[model samples]
Target: MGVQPPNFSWVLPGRLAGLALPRLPAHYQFLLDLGVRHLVSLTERGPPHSDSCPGLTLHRLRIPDFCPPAPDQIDRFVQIVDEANARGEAVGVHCALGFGRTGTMLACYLVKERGLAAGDAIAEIRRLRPGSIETYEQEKAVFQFYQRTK
Candidate 1:
């Protein structure tokens, strides 16, 4: 009913969200209450994933934010997000700071899911999180995403 924590923002309501927060007790409850049915993490580590989530699914996702995501890896992540949305699940993606890597993935989804061009996707993402694609390399990586999906 109120604003989500500052770390959390819905990139695509009912479809996807992104958060900077790490795993903890109340965090889990918050996500569950937020109706996040799936969580995809960009970091290889952080957060606790358990079968005990009552009704949530956790994806380790295992992509490091320090490097660009490979085309294949980007494709895989897209599949995960697409499938969840297709199944009517609320999905969230996270990176440590939840901007660079998370925002890139959201751009990927825009390109793949909505068929937006790279520039258009980035522009939309910036509205979601100001300056989401913060570097030329990150912007280049979004082009790579377009190469794979478009």
Candidate 2:
């Protein structure tokens, strides 16, 4: 059976947006208005169409659905978030449902940036968004990586 999303407690202070874009134009427009200065999409590529939003930067990091994020991959994600935070930009990170891959990365961000313990960070995320992460596999992978890193 598929895992359900977990309830999360850690709410992002700024506007953290989510979108399920089946079309290119709508997605582009929504992203533009969201002030998504930096986008880290877990999808393999940006939308199929040539439609691009000016003044918005996009970073695509393809995170696979079934595996934990690799150290190098995590580093790249952290690098982008760090850069955006340094530049005072609003960053939005999304994976399929913004629950599995996105939540995992966000948890890492809390540990690295907010000085939260991995377990605490995970719990905080569950508290903030009810059923935020959809799979135990995702959680296990991230938690395992966290333990290894520590």
Candidate 3:
């Protein structure tokens, strides 16, 4: 599709969003302004950086880019999002640059949490944020996310 940056990019236009690190405090504030209270991070080294803000919650999945999360980790990831949705907490998912790792997680979420088929979930994620979930292995992993949960 088209080329673009991945940070804080909206998915489905109004429901969920994927993001990269905020280089400045104001950027984090921007998310708050958007009413996002919870953040789900999937990064390799550690959690993605963000300012400490009142009324904000951060959940870390800590999976590296370009690979699948350990089998059990996907279950945990779904649990975190399910709770957030139940609490009516606005949530965002992110990784280092917010594309590869971020997209994989979101795609998996769609399949696991939203009852979307794997291919459709991947298509929707790519439509929302370009250059996402790059790699054949990662694509296969999305299907695996569906398969394992099934």
Candidate 4:
């Protein structure tokens, strides 16, 4: 895989944004200038880096490594997104590498909030973030969670 890094980041029609992980400070700053006020980090918590921007509202979801986010976690994430949307804050969801876990979560958000089919949501995410690939297991987990929630 040659160290596949997260390359997918997108702003939805209504200002909802999603990004794959390993984001740098410059990128974060650029997004902040673009009006992204909320930064949702799916990575685990650690000491603040020198590049960390304190002014941006940061939220961490602390998803597990190499595993899909659980149903409860997904529910909480959706609630956060809903609240952010209500407040008119542009939100970004990010996870390490942004392919498996991040894509899974974004797909769930699309299905739950945007009323898109799981496949269609995934397709749109891939379209937004080219070469985006959600592993089979991750896709199934998100789809099952979506179905259960519905």
Q: Rate the local accuracy (lDDT) of all candidates.
A: 0.75, 0.60, 0.71, 0.68
Output the worst ten-in-a-row residue range by lDDT, candidate 3. 1-10
| Model 2 per-residue lDDT tens digits across residues 5-70 | 122122454434433222354455555454456766776556444145556666777877744566
- RMSD (Å) of each candidate, 1 decimal: 2.6, 6.4, 4.5, 4.8
Which is superior by lDDT, 2 or 4? 4
Clashes of 3: 1
Q: lDDT ranking from best to worst? A: 1, 3, 4, 2
* Consecutive 10-residue window with the lowest summed lDDT within model 1: 46-55
Better of 1 and 3 by TM-score: 1
Error of 3 at 40 (Å): 1.4
The TM-score obtained by model 4 is 0.79
Local distance difference test, candidate 1:
0.75
Candidate 4, pairs of clashing residues: none
State in Å the error of residue 30, model 3: 2.0
> How many backbone collisions does model 2 have?
15
1-150 per-residue lDDT for model 1 (tens digits): 223534688888878887875555556566778777787777877665334355667776666665556677677778888788787777888887778787888888889778888899999988988857656777888988787667
Ten-residue stretch with the least lDDT total in model 2: 1-10
| TM-score comparison, 3 vs 4, better candidate | 3
lDDT of 4 by residue, 28-111 (tens): 665566566776677875313415766567777787767778787788878877887787766767776666677777788888
Q: Which stretches of candidate 2 lie over 4 Å from their true place?
A: 1-11, 15-27, 48-50, 148-150
Question: What TM-score, over all chains together, does every model reach?
Answer: 0.85, 0.73, 0.81, 0.79
Model 3's lDDT to the true fold?
0.71
TM-score of 3: 0.81
